[PDB]
Structures are given as structure tokens and as C-alpha cells.
Amino acid sequence: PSALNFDSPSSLFESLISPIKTETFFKEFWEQKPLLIQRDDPALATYYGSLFKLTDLKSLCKDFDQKRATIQFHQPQRFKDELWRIQEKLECYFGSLVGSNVYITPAGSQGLPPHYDDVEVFILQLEGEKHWRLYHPTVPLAREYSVEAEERIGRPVHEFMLKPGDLLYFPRGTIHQADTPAGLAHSTHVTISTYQNNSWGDFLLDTISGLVFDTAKEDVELRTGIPRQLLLQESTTVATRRLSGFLRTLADRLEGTKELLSSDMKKDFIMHRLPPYSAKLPRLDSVVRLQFKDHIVLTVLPEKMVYIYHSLKNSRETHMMGNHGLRFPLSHLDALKQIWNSPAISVKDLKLTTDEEKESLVLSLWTECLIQVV
Amino acid sequence: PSALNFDSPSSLFESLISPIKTETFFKEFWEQKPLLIQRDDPALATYYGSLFKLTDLKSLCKDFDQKRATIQFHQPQRFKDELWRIQEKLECYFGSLVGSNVYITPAGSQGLPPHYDDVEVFILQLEGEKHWRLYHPTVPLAREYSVEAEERIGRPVHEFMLKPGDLLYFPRGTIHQADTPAGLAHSTHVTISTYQNNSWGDFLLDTISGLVFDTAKEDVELRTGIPRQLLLQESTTVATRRLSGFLRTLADRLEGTKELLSSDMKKDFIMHRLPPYSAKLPRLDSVVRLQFKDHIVLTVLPEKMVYIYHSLKNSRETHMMGNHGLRFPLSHLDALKQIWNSPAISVKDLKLTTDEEKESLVLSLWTECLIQVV
Amino acid sequence: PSALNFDSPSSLFESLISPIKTETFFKEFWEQKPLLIQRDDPALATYYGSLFKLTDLKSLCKDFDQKRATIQFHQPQRFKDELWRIQEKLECYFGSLVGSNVYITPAGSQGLPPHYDDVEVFILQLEGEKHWRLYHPTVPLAREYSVEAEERIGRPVHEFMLKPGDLLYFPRGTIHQADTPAGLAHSTHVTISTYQNNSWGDFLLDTISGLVFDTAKEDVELRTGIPRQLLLQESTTVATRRLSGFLRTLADRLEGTKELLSSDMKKDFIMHRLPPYSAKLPRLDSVVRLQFKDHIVLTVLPEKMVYIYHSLKNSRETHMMGNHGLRFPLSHLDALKQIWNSPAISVKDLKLTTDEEKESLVLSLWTECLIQVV
Ligand SMILES: O=C(O)CNC(=O)C(=O)O
Ligand SMILES: O=C(O)CNC(=O)C(=O)O
Ligand SMILES: O=C(O)CNC(=O)C(=O)O
Ligand SMILES: [Mn+2]
Ligand SMILES: [Mn+2]
Ligand SMILES: [Mn+2]
Ligand code: NI
Ligand code: NI
Ligand code: NI
Ligand code: NI
Ligand code: NI
Ligand code: NI
Ligand code: NI
Ligand code: NI
Ligand code: NI
Ligand code: NI
């Protein structure tokens, strides 16, 4: 029950927030308020204690910051197998990049000053205890990180002591501050984070181009040039009124829209996500199924070609630090769309001229591990 | 009258289309239909003949293509002074990049096959005659270049013979084809082009980010995360309906909007445009005026800083081939906005703490040639 | 008399400080106190006015700083011919690098705050007037630059107004401050500087190695190893007492020393100095003379070789920005020393085995312009 179940992205998330049900988490907590899961599970406490240890910092004897009396180890999933296993599963579950930072603070020391972050967090207490104080957001669902002065935050809303095996979730914009109680024991926790720049605002700006391109093919007013020197000649009343009309027309056009195109979001997720955790040949008469659907991008790029790219060979060692696929002719697009939008498809049923072309396509997909033979 | 008047961008354009009045050009021709200016000016004919010559191709003895029986010399303004002088003036006038291509076709040869272009063109006949046929657009105000089959274009709408000193204007999407009459004389013309990707559609996508950023600061619904796996899990009815609502809200928000921010259009124009054609010290008690306003970008970039960049030191030799400024603290933003939005301003009237800071600002602007002392 | 006489380094310096005699300058002023030369020479005023102009900054339309309300143009000798001519002559005269900076301050503005510099300066007033205040040094003959607070400098010792054609000399460590009088005219001056890190202390550290190398060849105590871990195991009484003895022995050894070797000073001067200002073949029976003696370094470097390097082909454009010669066998050293230490020498008189070797040596020197045929 408490033990992390790596069977599916769903079973991992369900086990991570145990005993809380996912229906409860999404209805009551997600992007709304903090969730504190205090447990009494010595097995889970031993498990959390193995995710990262103070000794792992000395097994790295750049990858960490020294903010006052706090060591921050960036992206431990680069070296810690279990965290790679957890974070990869969460990326499948959220459809968003999932990074992590380890925070180590000696006994009796204050951590970072009061602040809020731009990410949804899952804090796992690994070693020792840490005293937390949570305050009401000044900016609910903040899009940026910010420190907040103690005289602007008010009194804590939640205050508690985290111990190994405990989990704390809180949405972006939650003002917080933590300190290690005086004593012998230092504190070690991992902050697993997701949902950075994954808002409706980000999604609208990511899909707007495809919508304008489609509309302009049918509407000559969108194809019409702007007035001379508009880019240079404080703004004008004329431009805002025309743009209001265009946005209203696009809103009406969306009602009939069946497909939205991602300009960069889908592509950036696929290129940056973690690779899958690592420890039959198709024929004309076989049935195929596309596998790892949420790990693939199918785009048309310039004469144009169909491009397929996946995350199956992504570098684990570069994940979140910030510093693979195929190409086919446009004629293959109908057959590739048949594979994408089908639970299972016969190779002979593909929309290509020769039976050889059908076989070559599926053989290409199989060499990348993008298809499974049923 | 006919002679090109380089006094201002306005006087250059007025003289270029002589005897046609700019009021007539904008009301009747611009982005609507072709304008043929056939003249009887031997002085202008000699002038056009000096803009580019077949001999100039041999004075370049990559910079040109060999499309069938037509030589196309790219961007002659890189070496021809008079064309640099003309094109620079047109960039000020249009607020859009202005490139050119020279077309040389021997007597008796067909040019390029029927097609339409994605730019507004001004064709100047420099040497010999060329036989033109213009057809009705299949795609009015086309956003892309395309060849069109002779059996899809119909009969010509306009047919004429261009000779030196003649000008031909036509909007993007105009299907056309030209051939050099049989005889002794080859044809040389220059196609001055502008308004590539300068439509209302391009402008809407260029300003939309600033609008969403501003709205999301006040609207928590734009700050709210998308549903899990939306980027991956064919599109849904839910997303299109939410996006329709957001676009309608943004349209209402635009009515009250006084300023629009350019994400890239203004910046790309400034970085790529031609430099100005080339052949008093400010004090605390002096009056200053910002000069070359349409050659400057003032942006805030990340801690944030105010960045100023101009086109006054742009490379002439790289113009349109595709292969300078200052930095100030955020405190200077109010004073820089005072300079931008003022016909003339006293240095002592600037919103800065010390009189020295006021003097340093204007001295910085003067070293870049961005200010004039009144 | 007042006009700059470029006949020799001596005649240039004599004319630069006119009407002051060089005997007076060295006895009374050099490294002792300021010298103000206020003149009434309209010809010299016109001459100074041509050395650098506010317009020369716009003829550069990195090479300058913008310190508050003062523009500082670094190393104008890179582009200004007359300043190259002056500074090159001064490097011959001083045997020290001679750089310059132009200072431009608008009317009514304060210059840099009170400070002292680490160089000997010759300030030439080129355009307008500047109000100077000189104070008593806090650090006489300072080795570093430093600002000094107004409450630590006392009252001015000297106060004057510089006008075009005026010269001001002051030693390193002289606290000073200048401001442009209120009015219409900006101020332009050039600060010609020399004697940076050219002290007895610098010279002692530059020659000490050669002295220790020579002494250790004869003294086994200098060849003896230090005690184990001396470099690591706060200092000890034993080391200081031994070092006192060594320094006393070296002092006694210097009395008999006839030649001092430069570890880097001579080499750095030759590599960085300005090239000479630009607008017979030797035979066995000819008499030769080494020319540009103060532009050449003769060193033995590793099997060892004799290396000759000169400054005759130094880059003018890189002077003071901070970002040529021959090689011969060790057997040639006696003959090269004969050329160095002789006002004129017969080629046949050189200490080399064959007459051909004598001819080859002098032919090598002639190709670099290091020898003149008498
Ligand atoms: O432990 C700390 O000092 C601070 N940790 C965080 O801000 C966090 O996990 O977001
Ligand atoms: O001259 C030609 O053959 C074709 N010229 C053009 O297509 C043009 O100027 O757009
Ligand atoms: O002119 C000024 O403001 C200051 N000039 C100097 O410090 C100088 O020449 O050393
Ligand atoms: Mn128990
Ligand atoms: Mn006539
Ligand atoms: Mn006089
Ligand atoms: Ni860091
Ligand atoms: Ni935090
Ligand atoms: Ni506490
Ligand atoms: Ni990247
Ligand atoms: Ni591969
Ligand atoms: Ni194929
Ligand atoms: Ni080309
Ligand atoms: Ni064309
Ligand atoms: Ni014809
Ligand atoms: Ni570019």
C-alpha cells in the first residue's frame, strides 16, 4: 500500500500520496491548498531515507548551491536511480517536466527566508526533522518566484514538523519558510516539482499561431498589411479595435475547431523529459500498435517533410540542467495519422501505394521502438 | 519632379511613383491592384540605367542565381550606392525591410514560369524592354510564393512592354510572367520588395504575449494549470471552449489597452534594416530631442535592465542575406520614457535623483547619436 | 621654439615643456611637485587643438569610458598620427611605456571625484577651459590609483584654469580634481602618462634573479635545500635570519657586479612600445653600427640559443590596450656582444671562424633594420 508501485504512472502517483485518494487530491488540493501527509510507516521512512543521504553529497568526492546555511543539490535524479524511476513516472502522469532539488540544513539553522515558488511541489522528508510555516499567498498561483518580507505575510496558516516518511504538497504561490530544530540531527528533504509555465495562458499562446494560420487561409482581412509605420508610430486606437475584432472572430472559429497545434510546448516537453527507466519483427500480415504515444511528436517541417521525434534516448545526466527520431515524405502523413489515431492497425490497411512502402514504414517505426507487434 | 528627391522618406516615395500622387496610390493601388507608370523622361531613363548594369555583374569579376535563361542578382544595395540610398528611405517610409533583386534575361528568352510572390513590389526597368502579362490572383494577398500552371491562371488581365524609366507596382498574390522580346537587347530590371510577413495576422501574433501577460497578472483563470496530459491527450471540446472564453475576455481587455508590446517584429526590423546612407555636446542647461526614433528599440530584459538598440551601425554588406546599443538600470526607465514621448526635453527636467545622473544619461545617448541638442 | 621639434627624443621633450629647461624640470619638478606651464602662443594653441577634437569621437561613427558626466577616450595614438609621433619620442626619452587618455567634459559639469594616479602625467589642454585643484599627496609617489574623500584631502595647494596651449605636469600620488566652468565651451584635454611600475623596488625585483643565479654558482649555501615542509610549516625565526644573511652577502657581491640582467622589464617595454613613426647592403670590407639600440633585447634561451627581438614592427593599433626578431647559435654571442658594445665595427673584425659566418650575421641584422653601413 505505502510502498511505491511502479506498474503505471497512475499507480505510482496513487502510492506516492497514500493514504489520500487521487479523486480527493484533485478535487480538494491540486492548485488550491496544501496537503500534509504525516505517517507512521517505518518501512516508508527507511525507503525515503534511501532516496538521498548526506553521504551522497560526499560520494560526489556546480551540482549544488550554498544559500546561507543551506546546501541545495540540483537534480539528484541524474545519479539517484530511484528518483529517476519516480520522476519519469510523474512526467507521464502530469505531461509536464518534473525536476527535483535536495535541501540539507544543519540542526538549529534557519533555511531560506519567506518566499513562494512558480511550481507545484511534493516535498519528501528523507532525514531528520524540519519545522515548516505556511502562509496565505499574496499572489495565488504565482507565475514567478519571489521572496516576501515577514511584515507582508501575516501569521502562519499551517505550522508543523516534518519527519522521515512524511510528504507535503503545496501549490505555486504558497508562501513558506522552514528551519531545522535545535538538536543533533540535520534535515534532508527532496522537493519534487512540476507545472512550471503550464497554465491556460501558456497553452493559449502555444496554440494561437496554428489558429491564426488556419483562419488567414480563409480570411483576407488577416492577410492584409498593417498601416505603414504601425510598429513604430506609443500605440493607437485603430490597432486595438481591429485586434478586438480579430480575437472575437478567432473565438467563433474555435467552436468549430477539432484540432489544436502546439508551437513549442509539446516539442520542449519531449526534448527535455527523462528517458524511460532501464536496469518481434513486423511483417505485412501482422497487426501493429503505436507505443509510448506521450513520448512522440509528429510535425511537418520544410519542400516539406514529416518529422517524428521521441524522448526514449534522452540524456538522464542532463535532465533539467539547461546546457532522436525519423523523417518521411508528405505522402506518408495519411498512413502515420492512421497509426497515431488507432488502438491497433493491420500493416496491409495502411494508406500507401505499394505493400513494400507499408512494410518499410512500420520497419522504420520498429527500429526506434515506436511500434509493438500484436 | 521626376528626379528622385532624397530630402525625406516621404519625398523619396512621392518622387519614385511620379506623376502619381501618394493619396491616389494608397486609396486605389496599394494591396489592391497593379499600377503601371509608363513615362517619357530621357533623364529618368538615364538615371534608371545607372542603378544597375549588365557590366556591374562583370565588375563582380553566390550573389546570384541562374534560374533557366534568367540571371538573378540578390541584394545589389550591398554594392550599389544609389539603391542603398533608395531602399533605406523606403524602410523609413514603410517601417518594413526593403530588399531587391536584379533580373537579367537575354533577348528572345522566356523568364521565370507564371507565379505569385509574398511581397509588395516596385519594378524599375533599367535596360532594354520586357514583355509582361499579369493575371487575376488565385490567392489574393498571398502569404507565400507559388508557381501556377498556365491552365489555372486564365487570360492576362494586363499586358504591356516595359522600357527604361518605367515603373510597375503590383500587390502580393498577383500572378505574373515576363519574357524578353526577340531582338538584340537583353532586359535588366530591379524588383524592390517590401511587406513580407507584415500582415494583421503577424501583428496580432506579435502583440498577443504582452496582452496575455498583463491580463494574467489580474486574472487567476489564465494563471491556472491546464488539465493533466492536455498537450498529449487529437484535441478536446473542453480546451476549445475555454480558449474561446479567454480570447473574448482579451478582446474586451483590448478596448481599455493604450499600449501594445512587440515580441519580435520591431526588434527584427531594427536588427536587419539598412544603415543610414553615408558619403554639439549636451549639458545640464541644454534642451534635448531623441533623433532616429524609428531606428531604436527600448526593452526591459533580465534582475532586469533597460536595453536600447539601434540600426545606425548595421552592416550594409549583409542586408537581406540572412547569415549596437546601450544598457541602463530600471530606475532610468521613467527618464528614458520622458525622452521617447517628448518632441524636446530639458536635461534638468529628467526624472533622476542627481543632476549628474541626468547628464550621464544624455551623454550616453549622444555617444550613440540617439540625441540632438536643441 | 614653442613648435614641437621631432629631430630627437631630447629635442621633442625640450620643446614639449617650453619655456622650461630640462635641467630645471629634472632638478625641481620631476617626481617632486606640479609644474604649470601657462602660455600665450596662438600657434601652439591651434597645434594642441589639432591633437584631438570632439569631432574625432564622431569620426569613430569600447575605445572609451563614460564615467559620470565625463567621456574618456583610451589611447588616441592608435588613430591620431601627431600623438603617435609625440608618444613614440617620449618612450625613447623615458625608456618607459607612454600611453594617453582624452577627457571630454561638458560646460558646467564636475569631472571625476578627488583621486591620485600611479603614473607621471603631462596634461595638454586642447579645447576649452578646465578648472583644476591640486592637493598635497596622502601617499607621495603612490604605486596605485585611489579616490580620496574630500574631508581627507585638506585645502587645495594649487588652483588654476587651463586653456588651449597650456601644459600641466604632476607626479604620481598628486591628489587632483577638475571641473568645466559654466558657460558654452566643453573641455578636451589629453593626459600623456609614463613611469607606471618603474620604481627602484620594481627594478630590484627585476634584477634579483640574475644576481642569485650568479651567486649560487659560487655559494653552495644558496644551492642547499630548505628545511622539510618550510613552505607550509605562519613563518619561522630560522628562515628570516638565513634570508637576512643571504641579502647581506648579495649586497657585498653587488659592489663587484658590472652587469645586471632584466628578468622582464626590458622585454615587456620592447614588446609593448610604439613602432617608429612612418609617413646600403653590408659587405666583408664595410664598417657596421648597431642602430635603434633601445628597441632591441639580446637574450639566451633554451640546448640554448641567442635570441634577438625588437619593437620596429610593433602594432600601433594595439598600443596600451592589453589584448619580430632573430635566432643565432651560442657561438655567435661573442660577435653579437662586439656589435652591441661598439660605436662602429668592421665586419672582418667579428669573432667568428669563417668570413662567410661574419657576412651572414650582419646580413641577418640588416634584413631586420638593426644595422647601418658606415
Ligand atoms: O528547506 C528550505 O530551507 C526551503 N525549501 C524550499 O523553499 C522548498 O523546498 O521550496
Ligand atoms: O523577369 C522575370 O523573369 C521574373 N521577374 C519576377 O518574377 C519579378 O520581378 O517578380
Ligand atoms: O578631467 C578630469 O575630470 C579628470 N582627469 C584626470 O584625473 C587626469 O587627467 O588624471
Ligand atoms: Mn506504529
Ligand atoms: Mn518627349
Ligand atoms: Mn600675445
Ligand atoms: Ni544553482
Ligand atoms: Ni521554496
Ligand atoms: Ni523552528
Ligand atoms: Ni534545451
Ligand atoms: Ni534512434
Ligand atoms: Ni516509405
Ligand atoms: Ni539564391
Ligand atoms: Ni515574380
Ligand atoms: Ni513576349
Ligand atoms: Ni538575423
Ligand code: NI
Ligand atoms: Ni555604438
Ligand code: NI
Ligand atoms: Ni546614470
Ligand code: NI
Ligand atoms: Ni575603460
Ligand code: NI
Ligand atoms: Ni587623474
Ligand code: NI
Ligand atoms: Ni570650477
Ligand code: NI
Ligand atoms: Ni602583452
Ligand code: NI
Ligand atoms: Ni622581421
Ligand code: NI
Ligand atoms: Ni652564422
